[PDB]
Amino acid sequence: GSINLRIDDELKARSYAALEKMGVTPSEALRLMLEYIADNERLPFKQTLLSDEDAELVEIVKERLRNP
Amino acid sequence: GSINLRIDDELKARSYAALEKMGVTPSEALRLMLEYIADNERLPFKQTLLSDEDAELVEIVKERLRNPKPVRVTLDEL
Amino acid sequence: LMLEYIADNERLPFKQTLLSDEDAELVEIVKERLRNPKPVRVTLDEL
Amino acid sequence: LMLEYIADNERLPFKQTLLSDEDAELVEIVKERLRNPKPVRVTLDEL
Amino acid sequence: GSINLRIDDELKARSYAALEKMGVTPSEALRLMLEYIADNERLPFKQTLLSDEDAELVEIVKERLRNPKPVRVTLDEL
Amino acid sequence: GSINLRIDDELKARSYAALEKMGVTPSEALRLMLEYIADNERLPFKQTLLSDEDAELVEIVKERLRNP
Amino acid sequence: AYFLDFDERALKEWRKLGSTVREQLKKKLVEVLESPRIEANKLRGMPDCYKIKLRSSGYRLVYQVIDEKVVVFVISVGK
Amino acid sequence: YFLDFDERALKEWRKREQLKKKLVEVLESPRIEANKLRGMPDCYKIRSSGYRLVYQVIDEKVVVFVISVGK
Amino acid sequence: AYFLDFDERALKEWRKLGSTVREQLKKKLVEVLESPRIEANKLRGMPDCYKIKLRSSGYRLVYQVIDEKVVVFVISVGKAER
Amino acid sequence: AYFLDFDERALKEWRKLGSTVREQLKKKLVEVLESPRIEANKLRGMPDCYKIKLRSSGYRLVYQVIDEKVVVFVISVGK
Amino acid sequence: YFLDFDERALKEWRKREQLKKKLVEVLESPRIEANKLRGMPDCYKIRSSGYRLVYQVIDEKVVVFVISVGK
Amino acid sequence: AYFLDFDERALKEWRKLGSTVREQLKKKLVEVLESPRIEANKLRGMPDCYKIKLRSSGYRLVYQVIDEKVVVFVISVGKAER
């Protein structure tokens, strides 16, 4: 198969530059993310949005454990 | 710009399925990763290969700190 | 057996979560006051 | 009371330090093998 | 070079006592600290004043992440 | 009282430079260390020499907990 | 759909499993190969290592998940 | 296990069938490590609705203590 | 670079900075926007939060980096405490 | 020989201690002022904070040790 | 508490009066948090000589398990 | 700068590096000697140990910083594993 990606010119530059430094090809990089996403049903990035939602739930528990 | 990615047929199927469930387009996903890599200079995955390389480095440090044999030196000696 | 534990340790084998959220109260008053500290140097005579 | 714990949790209230230094054995064989890894890709057919 | 330090009489007493117990000369102790400060750009003591400054920064972050109100902006807006 | 310290010229430079950045005077810095040492009977630096002696004691315990 | 790597030692151990026991481990490996991170089987003390545990027999498989290569790396098989 | 409710949590509950269905499973063997609210002592969470109940398990009194119910 | 989000409170605080102080905070912000994780400025006690510190003035900016959206989320701007 | 700072609130609390109770807290404060870090009284959850605990009465003092200013900072007094 | 010795530790012991004096205090209330050998589960250390004994306290069997004696 | 100690094993390893590779390790060592704690190169799992990494060649130097003696203690030099 094949995928065609619309990409900003400057981002093509900086991301490819970085990939050469890492010694990973752009195709390998993108096929990893797609395989990951396919198997884990999520993005590989830190779930900090969900993370600091839990942190606020804890802040409410804390306040309530002060005077039960 | 534009990128052409050669992709296995089944992986296109499975990843597209997954992306739709998430409501993320294949382009948005890939543009996040490329932007991340560009700014952070690493893949967004857990750096576990690097992690267990250090683990063995730690193992050599541990073994050697059992009977340390320090030698004070200058750069000119090196 | 459990008695032999409580004999020596002078506590229960379970985790003292009651003291956990009693030391959390203190931390709170401390965390709160560290926000607005008002330090004052004192002779022990001045106590 | 302690019985009511062991009833539900299906373990002892004390900390299972025996499983601690049983999982340490495994970690060892794993830490050791991660030193000299010898990876081999396998069809599940090839199993 | 040379440094002259003005020191309280009792502190000279007590610190010298302590230094002898350790078998460290007053000069060696002070030359360690000056070298540390020069290279690390901080005092060798626990940075607890900075620690509980961050603790309050964390407290403001926590309070604000309860009801976050993000606004996407560009630098030119700033 | 007074203390006279013999100091390498280059170190006087770099350490004073750094102290100005930190907004701490050289006299304050040295009086802190002396007071600390006087009260704690140790240097304010990390006790990493003692720290990695304990780490090796642990390494021996670990090996022995393998086959008791 | 992660790739599967076996350490050679892990593969040698595997070869001398009873036909019965490897059949049931294999049934759980394929579940693992799709979504490899099971929070309950986390081998505490090592990066990204997990167990596969058998009710009967008491045999144990240990694998590490390497997301950056999308592989599940089988390190140990035995008891 | 015993079941305790904080006064605030009970006010939330009043304003439920499916959660209660999960609570009785919680009441026998209360520690489900997968729902561990990490960052807090002995606290845990309980598909649809996206509503969240939070309880603490106290080994020394065999109670499940429901502290919060909502979103 | 990462996208830039400001919390409403943070933007209000930003507005009433001296032209000079926001000028230097801004200049370090554009650097942050292309490499937001400076582990040295890591704000311990909250997920993925970091500081921007000004030597003079003593002002502090706090942002959280949200990788999943490639945004830097500026939460607080000011100088807490005396 | 650390310096002693009291938070104003801590000092106000102190003012309304029984003459008896502050006398015994004070006896432990002066022990603290020389070698302030007692590993057993570490208030877990906050940087460098320690307790002074009284057998009788059950009153508690909380202080933080700031090595960089060689001060013991008394934050809380009460029960 | 019960007292167990590992075989290696006992070989060390043979090659003692002051340590034994501290062991009986250890045998009743074994957890002295100040001598915690940090970095290890439930392990602790026991002025002169600079010799070190290391033992582990196992709550589930009420034993003090002396693993190492020496320098 | 901090003093420099090499373990005997580490010095033996150093000796049999190509003139080029020890040349570039040395150049990063003099930088380390004046600011030995690069938290980014922090070797987690041991007290105060840090890495020096070479992009090419892939060689690794590991040192521990002992502040109480202001020394950098180079423990290992090589490339472990494949």
Numbering used by the authors:
A (entry chain A), F (entry chain A): 2 to 69
B (entry chain B), E (entry chain B): 2 to 79
C (entry chain C), D (entry chain C): 33 to 79
G (entry chain F), J (entry chain F): 2 to 80
H (entry chain D), K (entry chain D): 3 to 17, 23 to 53, 56 to 80
I (entry chain E), L (entry chain E): 2 to 83
From the paper:
The bacterial relBE locus encodes a toxin-antitoxin complex in which the toxin, RelE, is capable of cleaving mRNA in the ribosomal A site cotranslationally. Binding of RelB inhibits RelE by displacement of the C-terminal, flexible α-helix, which contains a tyrosine residue (Tyr87) that is critical for catalysis (Li et al., 2009). RelB is additionally known to dimerize through formation of a ribbon-helix-helix (RHH) DNA binding motif that allows transcriptional autoregulation through binding to the relO operator region (Li et al., 2008; Overgaard et al., 2009).
The final structure comprises three RelBE heterodimers in the crystallographic asymmetric unit (ASU). Two of these heterodimers associate into a heterotetramer by noncrystallographic symmetry, and one engages in a similar interaction through a crystallographic 2-fold axis. The structure covers most of RelE (residues 2–80 of 95) and one molecule of RelB (residues 2–79 of 79), whereas the other two RelB molecules lack either the C terminus (residues 2–69) or N terminus (residues 33–79) due to poor electron density. Two neighboring RelB molecules dimerize at their N termini to form a RHH-type DNA binding motif that closely resembles the structure of the isolated dimerization domain determined by nuclear magnetic resonance (NMR) (Li et al., 2008). In the resulting heterotetrameric complex, the extended conformation of helix α3 of RelB results in an overall very open, V-shaped complex with an RelE-RelB2-RelE architecture and approximate dimensions of 105 × 60 Å (top). At the position of Tyr87, which is required for the endonuclease activity of RelE, RelB has a valine (Val59∗), thus providing the hydrophobicity while removing the functional group. Structural alignment of two complete RelB2E2 tetramers with their RelB dimerization domains in adjacent major grooves immediately suggests why the complex cannot bind at high RelE concentrations: Due to the close proximity of the binding sites on DNA, binding of two adjacent tetramers generates an overlapping, W-shaped complex in which the two RelE molecules at each end of the complex (denoted as RelE and RelE′ in Figure S2A) clash.
